[PDB]
């Protein structure tokens, strides 16, 4: 049978079971041949695949289709023995997520899918045939893979010439090499987003070279030390520079030359001083300077020099006071300084009529300036765990305000004027139930009437 059925994975039969097989063969080999198909792992795997296809019908997967963060159809396969053949009939699928699928082979039937753009290989080593690999080389945008060993990553990852986003969340640090595993990353000329997470010690030379055409570089070392040493000066078109948990301990000196940057995030880098805003003046297009989850004693005066700030983030820091020069920036919209040792906000905040979202959570803010409420373009204000004794009645003049939070405050009075707003619902204004009763009910009943839809 092994020389005829081409199934060499039929183990030899031991004593007390080879004897009866020999007797049956002495009767006729037909029974032995028909029985041997239940001793081969290949037939067992084929039966598993067929039962998976029959059990996971097209309708069940279609109903299981979900929408991801980017608002597109996504299918999640977790711990399945394989990919059902009915899955590759979902031409409307756009993202295919595979997690903990053993010995997965991507069949040529993936070409039947046309809207597929992202492939998620979570701890799955996928082996792909030529017709399917050509389709992936032509019709795959992003590739997310998680792994523990360098060898269990696909070897055809560098063959995806149309790839745009690459997400590595493994451990690329091999044995005494400068990340030779990804030395083929230079092949990808269409790469736009890189999402390395391997606890980098020295930034790979291949990544520094390939970043000359990279848009969003996001790195996470989980607090592992990373040294730059004039590595980003080669890039000229980088816009996002997330370096969350990279243990830089300081803002790198090579980030100044990246004038094209617009988003910078250095969360959990254990920074000490951010006086480098004076050197940051090169970046005229910077609008999303993020530095939260860090430890900075105070905000330097050089923030006011930059006037293009729109997304300012210093949350979960220990900053005792806000210098008045920071308020010079007239285009802040997503300013959030939460979980900070603040005592009060200067009245210069009221000159920022362009503010949309503000978070002053976990701040010892006794009161707010009436000049702050004079702006009319506010959208959301999160105020959690703040020592507030009263709320000014002038907030009722806010019409564009969509939502506010007063949870954790030591409040006992809510102005009646707060209920006069064109846009006001239960979801937007959530406060303590006892404090909710201090307003007259004739407006609450009308609000509840319109809360349906």
């Amino acid at each position, epitope marked *: 049978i092994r020389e005829e059925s081409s199934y060499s994975d039929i183990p030899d039969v031991k004593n007390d079971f080879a004897f009866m097989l020999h007797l049956i063969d002495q009767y006729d080999p037909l029974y032995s041949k028909r029985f041997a198909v239940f001793l081969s792992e290949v037939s067992e795997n084929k039966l598993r695949q067929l039962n998976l296809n029959n059990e996971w019908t097209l309708d069940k997967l279609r109903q299981r289709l979900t929408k991801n963060a980017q608002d597109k159809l996504e299918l999640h396969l977790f711990m399945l023995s394989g990919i059902p053949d009915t899955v590759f009939d979902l031409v409307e699928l756009e993202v295919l997520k595979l997690e903990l699928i053993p010995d997965v082979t991507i069949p040529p039937s993936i070409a039947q899918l046309t809207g597929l753009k992202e492939l998620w290989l979570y701890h799955t080593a996928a082996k792909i045939e030529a017709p399917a690999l050509a389709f992936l080389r032509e019709n795959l945008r992003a590739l997310h893979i998680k792994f523990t060993d360098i060898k269990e990553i696909p070897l055809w990852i560098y063959s995806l010439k149309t790839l745009e986003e690459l997400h590595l969340t493994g451990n690329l640090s*091999a044995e005494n090499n400068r990340y*030779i595993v990804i030395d083929g990353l230079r092949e990808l000329k269409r790469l736009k987003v890189l999402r390395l997470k391997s606890n980098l010690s020295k930034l790979p*030379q291949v990544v520094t070279d390939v970043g000359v055409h990279l848009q969003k570089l996001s790195i996470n070392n989980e607090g592992t030390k990373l040294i730059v040493l004039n590595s980003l000066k080669k890039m000229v078109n980088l816009t996002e520079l997330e370096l969350i948990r990279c243990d830089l301990e300081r803002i790198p000196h090579s980030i100044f030359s990246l004038h094209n940057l617009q988003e910078i995030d250095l969360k959990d880098n254990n920074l000490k001083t951010i006086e480098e805003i004076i050197s940051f003046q090169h970046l005229h297009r910077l609008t999303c300077l993020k530095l939260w989850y860090n430890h900075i004693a105070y905000i330097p005066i050089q923030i006011g020099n930059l006037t293009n700030l729109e997304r300012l983030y210093l949350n979960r820091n220990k900053i005792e006071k806000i210098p008045t020069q920071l308020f010079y920036c007239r285009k802040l919209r997503y300013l959030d300084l939460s979980h900070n040792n603040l005592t009060f906000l200067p009245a210069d905040i009221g000159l920022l009529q362009n503010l949309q979202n503000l978070a002053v959570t976990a701040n010892r803010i006794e009161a707010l300036p009436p000049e702050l409420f004079q702006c009319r373009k506010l959208r959301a204000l999160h105020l959690g765990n703040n020592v507030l004794q009263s709320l000014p009645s002038r907030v009722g003049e806010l019409t564009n305000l969509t939502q506010i939070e007063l949870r954790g405050n030591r409040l006992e009075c809510l102005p009646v004027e707060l209920g006069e707003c064109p846009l006001l619902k239960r979801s937007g204004l959530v406060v303590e139930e006892d404090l909710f009763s201090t307003l007259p009910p004739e407006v609450k009943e009308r609000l509840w009437r319109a809360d349906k839809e």
Partner: nanobody
Amino acid sequence: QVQLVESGGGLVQAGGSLRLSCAASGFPVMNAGMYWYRQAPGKEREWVAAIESEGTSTYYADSVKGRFTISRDNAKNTVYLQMNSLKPEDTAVYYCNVKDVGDNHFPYDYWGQGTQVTVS
């Protein structure tokens, strides 16, 4: 078939120049990324030279910056690597490598046999 074969192996004392080469079978060299790696006894493979596909741009490791010269010759369908008075500490076994040629089958990366160059 697809395979790489290189030559030029020979023990050369410090003070001269050695001209390496390669030979690609089954695929054009212009539409492919060619790499040069080095191997040493008791040491893991280290990247040396890379020439990019679709634009022919050279890439060197920080250890070998500004000393080697790599070129692609489509007439012979080969890649030429030339050093400049290589040090005895650079004595190693050089490996050719091209990954993900236009043909996409199970072997995605192809390596040469390997040539040992000795400097003392």
